[PDB]
Amino acid sequence: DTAIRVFAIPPSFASIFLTKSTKLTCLVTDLTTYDSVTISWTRQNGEAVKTHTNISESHPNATFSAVGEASICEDDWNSGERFTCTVTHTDLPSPLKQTISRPKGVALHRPDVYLLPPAREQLNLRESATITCLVTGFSPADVFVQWMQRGQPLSPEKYVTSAPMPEPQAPGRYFAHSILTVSEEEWNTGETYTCVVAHEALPNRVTERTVDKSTGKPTLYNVSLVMSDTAGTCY
Amino acid sequence: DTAIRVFAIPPSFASIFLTKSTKLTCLVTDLTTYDSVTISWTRQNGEAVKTHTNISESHPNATFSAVGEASICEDDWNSGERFTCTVTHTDLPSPLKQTISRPKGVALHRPDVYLLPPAREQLNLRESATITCLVTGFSPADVFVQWMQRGQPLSPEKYVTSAPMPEPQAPGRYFAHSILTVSEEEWNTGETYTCVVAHEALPNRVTERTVDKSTGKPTLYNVSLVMSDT
Amino acid sequence: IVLVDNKCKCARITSNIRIIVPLNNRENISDPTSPLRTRFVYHLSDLCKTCYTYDRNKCYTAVVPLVYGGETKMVETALTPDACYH
């Protein structure tokens, strides 16, 4: 029972924001692992597009690592142009079409970022601090997140993020979740961690929050305000 | 679901915890449209098992995708028993019986549950409140989160839970999370809430956690006023 | 009647003296990466001529780096986007 699976990689919001380009690919895996694979793309208008040329393909070791880079301006994808990919094989004459497009029309709503520190229990355990950065009541999907310590950036595998799942009260809207786990030394030291996120619905398209050990639920204040010259000239 | 295939869906841990019973299913794919399907359940030792609770309705796939039903106390499924769906078909002189087992031999790890209250920023907004339950360091990935308002249940629509995501920064120690959305007034009322988790890698097969305003306030103040004409 | 209504420190002196002192704020306002300055000073003479709060009409900003696929790039981000513009 050989299951011929098919995958498609469309563009991403971080790519348009930074690379300002487009990248759409379609491939088939879990089948005869070798060369001689037929793939083609065609826009909604039926015209040709940048076909895979000088792009990586399956390695000689039956390692399917083909990639794609459709040199198409971000605007065409922004309109949500219907890109149709036709995947076919020499031993699979039957056609296989895959239509990908941006959903036309969505109730854009600004995100609501938050930041919470490691729970008192985890910190008391003194094994690993964990900081939460969540994003509620936001749409549409494709939100990028990043984490930073003391201003400098941080590696992607040092933290994880959730996909946008439907929201209970707002099925149209979604929520995302991010967790950054580190040792119990940086946070205990007082490291000021910062969480940045980029959503399309946001006006500035980018936002961030931050928190350190003290700002993480100050166990005790140390306010020492002084009111010099309580009355003079002004009152 | 084609090319002559039979898939087995044994009772998952979440189904065991909620339904509190076992229900084994041997879905038959590409099964020709033919009634009187004698898909009778039977133990690996061949002992009698209650037959399927009838066959479900037809499907647009032009296949009688039978759904076998089974019932057992708890231990058989926990024991080294293997259910076998006969999957009898007249148009098949050499039928294949679908085998269902309970594999074991996985590293155990204590789930670490941490419940965290609504973010300090949400307090000022007053528009609503959210509570987060995080779970880390456990195996396998079969947790089941539930929220209880002082032991009482709650309609599952008002909360959501992510699947188990992997933890690449750990040796395959799966982690997960879930949320619960509530009105702000409810949180300012000081009520209590509990994030119960069902996972096999537990001493008592259940863990409990709870937080309220009490564990979300500072310990003391050190204010110091200074008033003078200087 | 309102002699001074400084919104930098929220000091209003009707001649009443009201001063709100928000605790949650970093020492340096330019960036959040600074100690937490718990001390607070309210010099009436100087005030009647280093802020702590943020004015409703004022929309602060700070530049931060970002890395997605290529190189680190600096982008401006507003500390109070709601003031700037669910």
Side-chain angles (χ1 to χ4, degrees):
Chain A
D1 308 330
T2 49
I4 295 155
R5 288 290 95 189
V6 72
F7 265 92
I9 297 146
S12 302
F13 184 73
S15 305
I16 178 167
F17 206 84
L18 171 52
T19 48
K20 302 250 178 170
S21 75
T22 319
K23 268 161 260 288
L24 55 103
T25 314
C26 56
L27 83 179
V28 71
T29 169
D30 305 335
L31 79 180
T32 52
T33 47
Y34 79 118
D35 220 317
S36 198
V37 295
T38 325
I39 42 156
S40 307
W41 278 100
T42 293
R43 65 185 69 188
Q44 67 194 7
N45 198 279
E47 311 174 352
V49 286
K50 187 256 166 64
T51 303
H52 276 48
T53 324
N54 319 330
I55 314 307
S56 76
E57 54 251 47
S58 72
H59 306 145
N61 207 335
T63 316
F64 256 53
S65 200
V67 300
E69 198 172 9
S71 55
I72 178 158
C73 88
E74 57 83 17
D75 165 22
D76 314 328
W77 164 240
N78 182 85
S79 204
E81 273 200 355
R82 296 215 76 189
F83 298 106
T84 63
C85 158
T86 51
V87 306
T88 38
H89 200 78
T90 46
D91 295 321
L92 302 168
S94 59
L96 264 159
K97 315 190 184 179
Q98 318 186 96
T99 69
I100 289 155
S101 187
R102 201 178 193 76
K104 311 105 181 189
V106 298
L108 279 148
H109 280 276
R110 67 211 187 75
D112 190 348
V113 188
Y114 287 106
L115 207 70
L116 314 105
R120 292 175 189 286
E121 305 87 316
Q122 180 155 27
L123 297 161
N124 182 22
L125 157 65
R126 302 284 263 285
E127 190 64 29
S128 285
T130 321
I131 310 97
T132 318
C133 194
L134 72 88
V135 186
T136 311
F138 95 109
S139 45
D142 317 328
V143 66
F144 172 75
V145 193
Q146 191 178 322
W147 289 70
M148 291 222 300
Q149 168 162 232
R150 211 88 76 170
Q152 51 171 351
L154 296 160
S155 88
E157 302 193 46
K158 206 81 199 74
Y159 60 88
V160 192
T161 73
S162 147
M165 327 330 301
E167 266 180 21
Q169 83 305 2
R173 301 175 180 71
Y174 328 92
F175 79 98
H177 193 119
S178 174
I179 62 102
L180 185 135
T181 321
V182 282
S183 307
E184 301 269 68
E185 66 211 344
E186 271 69 53
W187 212 86
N188 286 68
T189 309
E191 267 275 24
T192 312
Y193 284 99
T194 84
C195 160
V196 193
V197 59
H199 179 35
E200 198 171 7
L202 192 74
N204 200 357
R205 313 286 162 162
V206 177
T207 173
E208 63 176 344
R209 261 81 202 287
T210 172
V211 76
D212 82 312
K213 193 196 180 189
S214 47
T215 316
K217 312 307 296 177
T219 322
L220 75 177
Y221 300 125
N222 207 318
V223 185
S224 47
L225 72 102
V226 304
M227 171 155 198
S228 167
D229 195 345
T230 181
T233 320
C234 322
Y235 186 69
Chain B
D1 289 48
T2 167
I4 309 301
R5 280 195 279 89
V6 193
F7 229 84
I9 294 155
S12 58
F13 200 105
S15 46
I16 291 153
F17 180 42
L18 182 135
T19 56
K20 299 290 195 184
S21 286
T22 68
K23 197 93 82 82
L24 279 85
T25 48
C26 48
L27 190 134
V28 198
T29 66
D30 202 76
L31 184 280
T32 320
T33 51
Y34 150 74
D35 309 2
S36 85
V37 302
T38 316
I39 317 191
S40 59
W41 294 89
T42 177
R43 287 123 185 171
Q44 64 104 49
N45 75 337
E47 205 172 1
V49 182
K50 188 245 167 192
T51 186
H52 66 90
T53 317
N54 208 323
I55 307 301
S56 179
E57 67 219 330
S58 312
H59 266 102
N61 310 330
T63 185
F64 268 52
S65 190
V67 190
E69 297 85 338
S71 302
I72 214 72
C73 175
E74 171 43 38
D75 160 14
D76 158 56
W77 184 234
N78 272 293
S79 77
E81 259 280 322
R82 187 203 315 172
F83 278 74
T84 46
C85 262
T86 54
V87 191
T88 317
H89 197 74
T90 57
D91 313 288
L92 259 172
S94 47
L96 55 144
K97 316 190 282 176
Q98 194 67 4
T99 49
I100 323 185
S101 183
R102 191 68 166 180
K104 315 189 185 176
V106 187
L108 274 287
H109 283 283
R110 273 289 104 76
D112 282 15
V113 189
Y114 306 129
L115 181 68
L116 271 156
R120 172 156 55 172
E121 283 67 343
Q122 187 63 84
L123 328 165
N124 285 89
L125 274 85
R126 177 232 45 67
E127 65 190 7
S128 297
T130 54
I131 313 96
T132 170
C133 207
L134 191 81
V135 298
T136 69
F138 52 87
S139 300
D142 40 356
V143 311
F144 185 75
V145 173
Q146 280 301 118
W147 296 81
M148 310 226 76
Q149 178 162 358
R150 154 51 201 191
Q152 293 82 71
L154 48 63
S155 204
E157 309 85 328
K158 71 195 280 267
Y159 87 117
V160 190
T161 294
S162 150
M165 336 323 282
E167 190 128 39
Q169 79 199 316
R173 279 155 64 74
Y174 273 114
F175 89 95
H177 76 114
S178 182
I179 78 185
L180 166 48
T181 81
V182 314
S183 158
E184 190 92 53
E185 68 91 6
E186 182 167 351
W187 176 234
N188 331 95
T189 38
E191 288 191 353
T192 175
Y193 295 118
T194 323
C195 165
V196 71
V197 311
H199 193 242
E200 63 84 28
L202 272 168
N204 56 349
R205 200 152 281 98
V206 63
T207 318
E208 204 73 339
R209 283 290 185 288
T210 167
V211 303
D212 70 331
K213 293 213 209 72
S214 304
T215 192
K217 280 206 76 53
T219 56
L220 60 105
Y221 285 72
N222 194 343
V223 64
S224 164
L225 194 73
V226 181
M227 289 253 285
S228 58
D229 62 335
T230 77
Chain C
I1 193 168
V2 182
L3 308 185
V4 202
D5 194 329
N6 175 29
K7 321 306 296 191
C8 156
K9 275 150 179 164
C10 321
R12 167 165 69 270
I13 292 148
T14 298
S15 91
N16 176 330
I17 295 94
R18 218 281 290 288
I19 294 99
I20 293 154
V21 51
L23 186 273
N24 296 306
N25 261 301
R26 303 293 196 289
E27 175 166 14
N28 195 320
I29 296 282
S30 303
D31 65 342
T33 307
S34 75
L36 190 92
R37 180 170 35 65
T38 58
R39 277 170 70 77
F40 297 103
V41 286
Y42 304 90
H43 209 253
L44 273 283
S45 323
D46 194 284
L47 182 135
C48 298
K49 76 202 300 197
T50 49
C51 292
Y52 321 119
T53 86
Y54 299 131
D55 156 74
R56 298 184 177 179
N57 285 253
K58 194 75 174 65
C59 156
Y60 265 74
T61 303
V63 73
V64 278
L66 274 159
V67 194
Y68 147 71
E71 58 280 10
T72 316
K73 60 137 188 279
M74 308 210 77
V75 189
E76 74 85 24
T77 71
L79 267 162
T80 167
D82 312 318
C84 315
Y85 299 96
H86 293 178

